[PDB]
């Protein structure tokens, strides 16, 4: 929101002085960018599944 997003207005202290911000203030959030998921919680198909 504090960057130049087309069609939307701006919205513990951040960082400032960057060109695109002008006099505004910028903060950040932490998140995880995953690449795969694995879960850990017909009789013929079942039998083929077993060793």
């Amino acid at each position: 929101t504090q960057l130049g997003l087309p069609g939307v207005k701006p919205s513990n202290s951040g960082v400032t002085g960057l060109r695109s911000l002008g006099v505004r203030d910028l903060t950040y959030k932490i998140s995880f960018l995953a690449c795969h998921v694995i879960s850990i919680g017909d009789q013929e198909v079942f039998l083929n599944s077993l060793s």
């Binding site: 929101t1 997003l5 087309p6 069609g7 939307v8 959030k29």
Partner: protein, 81 residues
């Protein structure tokens, strides 16, 4: 505009149902009523939305379905029977 939801018989066990929204134009308005089970043919289409981008923080587009068609007496033989 009409909101369309997965029929409960189709939804897999232990999952919530999904939703989509459909746009109806000139000849198709009021073809269906709330609570009906309905079948739809149309174009699948997308557009930019500022609020989605602002809330999610990624260049994420929104999607919609534009309907082209929508779907859901007796003879003399029956009367004689």
């Amino acid at each position: 505009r009409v909101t369309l939801q997965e029929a409960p018989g189709t939804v897999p066990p232990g999952r919530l149902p999904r939703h989509r929204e459909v746009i109806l134009l000139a000849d198709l308005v009021d073809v269906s009523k709330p609570g009906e089970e309905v079948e739809v043919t149309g174009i699948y289409k997308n557009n930019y939305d500022g609020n989605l981008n602002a809330k999610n923080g990624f260049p994420v587009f929104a999607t919609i379905i534009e309907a082209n068609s929508i779907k859901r007496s007796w003879t003399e033989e029956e009367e004689r029977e």
